Amino acid sequence: MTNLLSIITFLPIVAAIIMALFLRGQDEAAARNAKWLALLTTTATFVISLFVLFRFDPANTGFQFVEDHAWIMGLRYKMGVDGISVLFVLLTTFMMPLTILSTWQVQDKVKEYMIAFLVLEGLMIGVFTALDLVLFYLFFEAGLIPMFLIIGIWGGKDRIYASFKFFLYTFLGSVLMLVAMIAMYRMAGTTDIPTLLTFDFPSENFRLLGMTVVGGMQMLLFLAFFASFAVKMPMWPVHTWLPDAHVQAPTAGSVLLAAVLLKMGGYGFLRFSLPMFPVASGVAQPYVFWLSAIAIVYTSLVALAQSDMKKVIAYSSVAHMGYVTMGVFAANQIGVDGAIFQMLSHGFISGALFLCVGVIYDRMHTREIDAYGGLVNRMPAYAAVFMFFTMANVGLPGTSGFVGEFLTLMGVFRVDTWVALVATSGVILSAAYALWLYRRVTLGQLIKESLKSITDMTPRERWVFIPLIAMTLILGVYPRLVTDVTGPAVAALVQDYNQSQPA
Amino acid sequence: FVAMLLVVVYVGAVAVLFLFVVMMLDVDFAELRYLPLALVIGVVLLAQLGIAFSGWTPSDQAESLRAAPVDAAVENTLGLGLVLYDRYVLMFQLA
Amino acid sequence: GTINGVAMGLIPRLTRAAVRVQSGYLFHYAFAMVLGIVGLLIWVMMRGAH
Amino acid sequence: MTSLDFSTILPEVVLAGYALAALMAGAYLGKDRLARTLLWVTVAAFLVVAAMVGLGNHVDGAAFHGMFIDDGFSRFAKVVTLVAAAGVLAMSADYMQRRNMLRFEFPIIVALAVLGMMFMVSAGDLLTLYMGLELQSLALYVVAAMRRDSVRSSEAGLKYFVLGSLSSGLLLYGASLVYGFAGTTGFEGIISTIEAGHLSLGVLFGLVFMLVGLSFKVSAVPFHMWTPDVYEGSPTPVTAFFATAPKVAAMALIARLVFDAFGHVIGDWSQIVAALAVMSMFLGSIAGIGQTNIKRLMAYSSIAHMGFALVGLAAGTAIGVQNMLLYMTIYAVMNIGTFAFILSMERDGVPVTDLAALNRFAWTDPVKALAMLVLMFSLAGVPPTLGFFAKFGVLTAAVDAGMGWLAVLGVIASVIGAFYYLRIVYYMYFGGESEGMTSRMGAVQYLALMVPALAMLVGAISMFGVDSAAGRAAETLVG
Ligand SMILES: [Ca+2]
Ligand SMILES: [Ca+2]
């Protein structure tokens, strides 16, 4: 119980190695064993990570559960959590058992499917626990490998193109960040994230090529990290990989792609860009505001034009991340708390919606909106669940969707009214595409022979959704469960950002 | 010595080359490119070398660093034999 | 259109140029080596003796 | 020659003695009936000589009026060369026998090539550099062309010989200019004369000629065009050899030359090395996308990786040399693993080399594809593989030297190169309709795939002191 973060990080990876070695047979019993072994492993990781959650002390804004060991090439293996990153660990471990349970009907290469998800979980958890600069980059980039194969092997008809675009687009943005990490390593003489959080990187302007670089070295380091996190988030206009990868991935892949991997971009902004490059962040605030405002309006209108149900959900995520980006760079307590809440909240809602798509994809094997209609007539439970998360997706008060949206909008209002006015229009636009999709798929008359015999959600499918409905309602009604944890850490973060602004 | 050694070696070696020319003689002996561009690169390379040799001067330390200074009273072949097999014995064996 | 134009239009076009230059002719490969030395010598000359 | 000189070169005498004795044993006691036995005694000899070089207590020094340098740098390079040479021979033994290619002279020719490499990395004189390089080069031409019934082996030897001879001539011409300027061939004399205020065009011309001559041996662009044809034409065991041991020896030789002879004009040669590294990284990455033959793909992979290794040397620092050494060590391990798999590829009992043969191989042999997957991501430089940490080290050296522009270009070319490694993974795991390629591997060849593949991950946890050993070795050279 002194290496708790290392256990939850590498336990899923170790289980995959054992499964790959000592699990034999390709029959259904052999596959049935793999599903159970994965489910027990993901459940174990979630339970152990609850010890972190409840022993965590929100008042302490330092890193807790810290473990440090020597490593290679003069680096250190250091892990830990604070009020900004603890909840992203629990979100990852929370979605993984539900994601496994939703694949229970997959019959194609099951053992390999389970291994890819078990390996992916360990690497996703490492991103949020790592306190070494290179160690963060290792988990940040290693996650591309299992996801590249998850899309390639189990994806749709365009999965070859989607998997390559996903990997290379993300890979391109992070290699620039790698060089910035090497530069910070050389200036500060350390890769320790706690030590880099107090280091003062130079901000005096200089000239590079034909332009002045406002912010000096901080701006150059800021732009390298921005390229990595902007693509990961994703921000507009570097988002066009997401409508491919999220759509062409298998349903389980889409859940983890949207619920967890997107949060690495926003967490990157909260861990590095604002603490380590405050002067550059202050300078970039106007541009980030309008890119995020454009993203909300742009992708909301693009979602309204989609003929493919899974693409509506994919484009919805880009709009929801636009709020997160604005909240982070408003750099006030209200905006940053809203940004973190919006990230966690979007994990439950977006994941649930991709599971709603899978429920009817499994039965009908199509994603065209026009291929459905009046499903409420045969699928009462599905229409209720799909409606609930449709309403959460439009930020209805009472669901967790509202809180994150509301606070990021109010934090931005304090800084820029034009941005807040444009971003706030998302409430009108989100309702438009979200309700139209729900109506066209679920409501109406059952007038197609194909849908005549469609079945309702099975008991297993209902039980996957119940935890997600619980978190959405609980956090919507009692968000203090989140802000108590993140409150003190955001307060310290916002204070350092202010104390670093040029005077 | 290297003047005479060079003739001795390449008289035999060039004759061997003649043997392979007639062994693999082409079937079109009776009637046996980008030459313009090639001549331009050759002229450029030759000009660069000529410019470098225009200002040639050895290092002012070159005299003091000689491993095998030449002796006027010793004949060339004897001088080479005094260094070839003792100072350069490692290279001799590698040859 | 831009991303695909670069990733799938431009880089493959540079690949085809590289494949073409690898002609398989020994005299071309020697020409490349001679161009490399001549170019590097031009570079050294501009910096001068110093 | 003193008794102290002879002690210093004893590992080389032991290897040379073995090669001569093996030649007579093979000639007089069975010829090709001993071919298998001579191959495995050569593997033991390489490992024995490496133990002599790398184990026990060593005190740095020089022998033969400084012509032979026995320092930590040369000892690091020799060990990697000998162990990589031993690995290539061991993993190829079964393949060559099945293909009726194992002459009793092949192990001996390889041993004399390795002997030449050992004198290369310990050179302290221009003549030692030349004689070591030429003993290696001549042995490499022979094995390139040793498949007598293959027109492609003959052409591989012909292209390698003609272009290798051209590069050697350029190297000699520069070596002659350096001797004329300095008045000596010894590097300790040369370094003292080549300094900031006395660099005539003549001596700078000499450095360029020597650098270009050597940069041919590491397939630096535009002195690279031999590599794809020679890699394709030569026997796959010989291609695997070219890709691992000569490149390590040649890379170490370049570091030896620029620091022990041109170490007071780092500014002059660092720019040239950087320009070579840039051209090699982008051409290797871009040209690799157009390859359908796996052997020819590895040549461009080799060219791009030598560009990255040159980034560490372009730094012109002890850290740059340390990380160049680690890069070459990891690169040699990766190529041993990859060429172990390439040797195994076959359809209907005949070897096969086209990439399309890998389609859906992961569903034919799961463990071998998983090993190949780790190697392809290691060559692409993707974490958590040890191949990523190799790139990280050279990029660290570049940034540390104020050459972030080189690091930025290096990582961008890595992205382009990552495509054709990813494509191999794509073929194996979710590729198109399969044509029945099988992987035939004996026990030794099988371990030549798995152990390097395991090292790419285990090395991510601990390098087992190799990174620390490379740092000590780099210090003895740079000072
Ligand atoms: Ca700070
Ligand atoms: Ca030195």
Q: Give one DSSP letter per residue of B21-90, joined into a string.
A: HHHT--TT-TT---HHHHHHHHHHHHHHHHHHHHT----TTTTTT-SS---TTS-HHHHHHHHHTTTTHH
Q: Is D169 on the interface with C (CB under 8 A)?
A: no
Ligand 1 center–CA A271 separation, angstroms = 10
B47 to chain C: nearest residue by CA? C38
Surface of A (184-223) touching D: CB under 8 A = 185-186
Q: How many CB atoms lie within 10 A of CB A82?
A: 24
Surface of D (74-113) touching B: CB under 8 A = none
Ligand 1 center–CA A5 separation, angstroms = 25
Cα–Cα distance, A95 to A316 (Å, whole number): 19
- Residue contact B95–D198, C-beta within 8 A: no
Residue ranges in D99-150 assigned as alpha helix (H): 106-121, 126-144
SS3 D271: helix
Smallest Cβ–Cβ distance between B61 and the set D1, D67, D193 belongs to D193
* The residue to which tokens 């389980």 are assigned: A252
Cα–Cα distance, D453 to D473 (Å, whole number): 26
Technique behind this structure?
cryo-EM
> Which ligand has the nearest atom to the CA of D62?
2
Phi and psi of D100, rounded to 5°?
Answer: 50, 55
* The residue to which tokens 């002609």 are assigned: C23
Amino acid at position D162, single letter: V
List CB contacts (< 8 A) between B45 and chain C.
34, 37-38, 41
- Residue contact D382–A171, C-beta within 8 A: yes
Nearest chain B Cα distance for residue C48, angstroms: 10
Cα–Cα distance, D374 to D411 (Å, whole number): 20
Smallest Cβ–Cβ distance between B44 and the set C31, C38, C49 belongs to C38
Q: Is D393 exposed, middle or buried (0-12, 13-18, 19+ CB in 10 A)?
A: buried
Q: How far is CA D68 from CA A8, A392, B43, B92, D193, in A?
A: 55, 77, 39, 14, 20
CB D205 within 8 A of CB C41: yes
Q: Is A151 exposed, middle or buried (0-12, 13-18, 19+ CB in 10 A)?
A: buried
Cβ neighbors of A408 (< 8 A, separation 6 or more) are A323, A324, A326, A327, A330, A335, A338, A339, A342
Which two tokens mark A273? 């860009």
Cα–Cα distance, A274 to D205 (Å, whole number): 51
Instruction: Give which of D209, D181, D177 is closest to D193, Cα–Cα.
Output: D181
CB A382 within 8 A of CB A451: no
Q: How far is CA B59 from CA B63, D198, D202, D413, in A?
A: 8, 8, 11, 42
CA-based end-to-end distance of chain D: 27
Rg of the Cα atoms in chain D: 21
Instruction: Give which of A497, A493, A489 is closest to A81, Cα–Cα.
Output: A489
Helix D201-217, helix D236-260: angle, nearest 10: 160
Q: How many CB atoms lie within 10 A of CB A203?
A: 20
Against chain D, the chains showing at least 3 CB pairs within 8 Å are A, B, C
Report the alpha-carbon angle A335-A341-A347, nearest 5.
Answer: 140
A149 to chain D: nearest residue by CA? D429
Which two tokens mark D209? 């000629």
Q: Is D243 exposed, middle or buried (0-12, 13-18, 19+ CB in 10 A)?
A: buried
Cα–Cα distance, A145 to C33 (Å, whole number): 39
Q: How far is CA A305 from CA A435, D362, D379, in A?
A: 13, 40, 42
CB D341 within 8 A of CB D439: yes
Cβ neighbors of B22 (< 8 A, separation 6 or more) are none
Nearest chain B Cα distance for residue D346, angstroms: 37
CB D111 within 8 A of CB D19: yes
Cα–Cα distance, C21 to D229 (Å, whole number): 13
Asked whether at least 3 C-beta pairs link C and D within 8 Å, the reply is yes
Cα–Cα distance, B93 to B84 (Å, whole number): 11
Which two tokens mark B60? 């002012």
Cα–Cα distance, D424 to A153 (Å, whole number): 14
Q: Is residue D222 reached through a cis peptide bond, with omega within 30 degrees of 0 on the bond before it?
A: yes
Nearest chain D Cα distance for residue B58, angstroms: 4
Could you tell me how many residues make up chain C? 50
CB A404 within 8 A of CB A345: yes
Residue ranges in D99-220 assigned as alpha helix (H): 106-121, 126-144, 151-182, 187-193, 201-217
Q: Is D408 on the interface with A (CB under 8 A)?
A: yes
- Residue contact C22–D287, C-beta within 8 A: yes
CB A20 within 8 A of CB A115: yes
Cα–Cα distance, A391 to A387 (Å, whole number): 6
Cα–Cα distance, D120 to D306 (Å, whole number): 18
Q: How many CB atoms lie within 10 A of CB A76?
A: 17
Nearest chain B Cα distance for residue C38, angstroms: 6
Cα–Cα distance, A372 to A241 (Å, whole number): 27
Instruction: Give which of D233, D389, D379, D201 is closest to D304, Cα–Cα.
Output: D379
Cβ neighbors of C14 (< 8 A, separation 6 or more) are D286
Smallest Cβ–Cβ distance between C38 and the set B45, B51, B55 belongs to B45
Surface of D (39-78) touching A: CB under 8 A = none
Q: Is D196 on the interface with C (CB under 8 A)?
A: yes
Q: Give the experimental resolution in Å.
A: 2.3
Ligand 1 center–CA A191 separation, angstroms = 14
Instruction: Give which of A460, A461, A482 is closest to A471, Cα–Cα.
Output: A482
Instruction: Give which of A307, A336, A375 is closest to A494, Cα–Cα.
Output: A336
Nearest chain A Cα distance for residue C20, angstroms: 26
DSSP state, D413?
A: H
Cα–Cα distance, D463 to A325 (Å, whole number): 40
Q: Is C42 on the interface with B (CB under 8 A)?
A: yes
Cα–Cα distance, A326 to A265 (Å, whole number): 13
Q: Is A113 on the interface with D (CB under 8 A)?
A: no
Ligand 1 center–CA A268 separation, angstroms = 14
List CB contacts (< 8 A) between C7 and chain A.
168
Phi and psi of D354, rounded to 5°?
Answer: -85, 145
Return the exposure string of D30-66: e unless at least 16 CB atoms fall within 10 Å of the residue's CB, then b: eeeebbbbbbebbbebbbbbbebbbeeeeeeebbbeb
Q: Is D304 exposed, middle or buried (0-12, 13-18, 19+ CB in 10 A)?
A: buried
Residue A275 is assigned to a ligand binding site: yes
CB A6 within 8 A of CB A89: no
Phi and psi of A20, rounded to 5°?
Answer: -65, -35
The enclosing H or E element of D59 equals none
SS3 A372: coil
Report the alpha-carbon angle B9-B10-B16, nearest 5.
Answer: 105
Amino acid at position D446, single letter: Y
Q: Across the strands, what pairs with A304?
A: none
Amino acid at position A2, single letter: T
Could you tell me how many helices (H) and strands (E) chain D has, helices first? 19, 5
Q: Is A474 on the interface with C (CB under 8 A)?
A: no
Instruction: Give which of A93, A160, A195 is closest to A467, Cα–Cα.
Output: A93
Q: Are strands D61-63 and D438-439 parallel, antiparallel or unpaired?
A: unpaired
Cα–Cα distance, A341 to A245 (Å, whole number): 25
Q: Across the strands, what pairs with A300?
A: none
Asked whether at least 3 C-beta pairs link B and A within 8 Å, the reply is no
Nearest chain C Cα distance for residue D285, angstroms: 9
Largest CA distance in chain A: 71
SS3 A200: coil
CB A471 within 8 A of CB A403: no
Rg of the Cα atoms in chain B: 22
Cα–Cα distance, D394 to D309 (Å, whole number): 7
Which two tokens mark D88? 């290539």
To 10 degrees, the CA torsion angle through D166, D168, D171, D176?
-100
Which two tokens mark D258? 């620029």
CB D468 within 8 A of CB D323: no
Instruction: Give which of B60, D313, D200 is closest to C44, Cα–Cα.
Output: D200
Q: Is residue A237 reached through a cis peptide bond, with omega within 30 degrees of 0 on the bond before it?
A: yes
- Residue contact D201–C44, C-beta within 8 A: yes
Q: Is A161 on the interface with D (CB under 8 A)?
A: no
> Which ligand has the nearest atom to the CA of D190?
2
Instruction: Give which of A483, A461, A227 is closest to A344, Cα–Cα.
Output: A483
Cα–Cα distance, D260 to D60 (Å, whole number): 15
- Residue contact A186–D400, C-beta within 8 A: yes
The enclosing H or E element of A278 equals helix A278-304
CB A255 within 8 A of CB A97: no
Cα–Cα distance, A252 to A236 (Å, whole number): 25
CB A423 within 8 A of CB A412: yes
Cβ neighbors of D145 (< 8 A, separation 6 or more) are D153, D154, D156, D157, D158, D234
Instruction: Give which of A90, A99, A91, A115 is closest to A5, Cα–Cα.
Output: A90
Report the alpha-carbon angle A212-A217-A221, nearest 5.
Answer: 110
List CB contacts (< 8 A) between B57 and chain D.
200
> Which ligand has the nearest atom to the CA of D191?
2
Cβ neighbors of D324 (< 8 A, separation 6 or more) are D251, D255, D309, D310, D312, D313, D394, D397
Helix D318-344, helix D386-400: angle, nearest 10: 150
List CB contacts (< 8 A) between A20 and chain D.
370
Residue A237 is assigned to a ligand binding site: no
**CA-CA-CA-CA torsion sign (A161, A167, A168, A170):** positive
Instruction: Give which of D339, D451, D466 is closest to D390, Cα–Cα.
Output: D466
Instruction: Give which of A447, A325, A316 is closest to A394, Cα–Cα.
Output: A316
Cβ neighbors of D134 (< 8 A, separation 6 or more) are D116, D168
Could you tell me how many helices (H) and strands (E) chain A has, helices first? 22, 4
Cα–Cα distance, A120 to A141 (Å, whole number): 11
Smallest Cβ–Cβ distance between A168 and the set D392, D415, D425 belongs to D415
Cα–Cα distance, A393 to A430 (Å, whole number): 8
Cα–Cα distance, D392 to A138 (Å, whole number): 11
Cα–Cα distance, A423 to B86 (Å, whole number): 87
Return the exposure string of A96-121: e unless at least 16 CB atoms fall within 10 Å of the residue's CB, then b: bbbbbbbbeebeebbbbbbbbbbbbb
